[PDB]
Amino acid sequence: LLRSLSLQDNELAALAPGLLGRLPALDALHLRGNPWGCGCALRPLCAWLRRHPLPASEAETVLCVWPGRLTLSPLTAFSDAAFS
Amino acid sequence: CPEVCTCVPGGLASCSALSLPAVPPGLSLRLRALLLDHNRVRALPPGAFAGAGALQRLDLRENGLHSVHVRAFWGLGALQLLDLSANQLEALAPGTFAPLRALRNLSLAGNRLARLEPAALGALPLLRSLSLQDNELAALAPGLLGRLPALDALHLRGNPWGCGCALRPLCAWLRRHPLPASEAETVLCVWPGRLTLSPLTAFSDAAFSHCAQPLALRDLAVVYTLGPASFLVSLASCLALG
């Protein structure tokens, strides 16, 4: 029955794919505020973004920590291929 | 509309006294000239205000800030005033204020640092003012002074400071920019003697207390060969005396 689930101001960086495997109806997932870095852990989250492009809204523009220390990259830039 | 309190015209209205351990939550794109007095923030989340492309004033006073993040201020490169009064910072994370370059007034009052990294602070060509009220810093890196090209306002009143070689760059700043000539700035340093104390204005350009010079080429050019020179002198004396 779950469809909406929020992660505002969380510190999560490594999300296990089991959570998305269990949830069959999640379609509203908010993430603003996160010490997250793009990586292999991000791939399930990128798949969720791909099947439901909620971050197309201006309200949800959550970011990463790219391997480069001085940079910064949103998930909306993190596309499906994302060869990093 | 933020959840914390009122937002009014101008840059914007912000909320002070929120004391949030991480950061008060905001859902807006228009907030400008922020006011964050009396908080309990300890670490700036990465990309806290990346939505706000341009910001002018931030007022982080009286916080529990102990360590910052490199990517907190990427989307912030227009700030010109910022306050860091009464924090518990231990070391400034490199790359935090590096994206910031338009700042001119940066008070760093009441910090808890043993030393500051010159690389972390950034060039900040526009910076001209810096405050150290109730700070406990005792050892400042000369690179901080070296990178800042326009620093002319150093407020320092209140320091568990020890008079010595660590004070020499600060004495140099005093002798090139005598701000402590004003009554408001009366920073003091503790003399090597625990019982006594001396204000900075007593610390003269010479200040013959300890640690005169760390390096000297006039002696470095001869120190390498001094030992062999002495040994050849001894050998020649042995040869000549017989």
Summarize the structure.
Chain A is an alpha+beta fold and 84 residues long. Chain A has helices at 17-22, 43-51; strands at 4-6, 28-30. The PDB classes it as transport protein.
Protein model, in words:
This is part of a larger assembly, with two copies of chain A. The first copy, chain A, is built from two helices and two strands; from the N terminus they run E-H-E-H. With 84 residues, chain A is of the alpha+beta class. The longest helix of chain A has 9 residues, at 43-51. In chain A, 23% of the residues are buried. The A-B interface holds A 8-9, 33-35, 58-59, 61, 63, 65, 69-72, 74 and B 22-23, 25, 27, 29, 45-48, 50-51, 69-71, 74-75, 94-95, 98. Chain A: It comes from Homo sapiens (Human). Chain A: Interacts with KCNMA1. Chain A: Residues 34-84 form the LRRCT domain.
Strand content of chain A: 5-15%
Spatial arrangement of strands, main beta sheet of chain A: 1-2
Distance between the termini of chain A: 35 Å
By DSSP, the count of extended strands of chain A is 2
Helix/strand/pairing category of chain A: alpha+beta
Rg of chain A, rounded, reads 12 Å
Oligomer: part of a larger assembly
How helical, in percent, are the residues of chain A?
Answer: 10-25%
Main interface: chain pair and counts: A-B, 15 and 19 residues
Largest sheet of chain A: 2 strands, parallel
Order of helices and strands of chain A: EHEH
* Shape, per Cα inertia axes of chain A: globular
Count of helix runs of chain A: 2
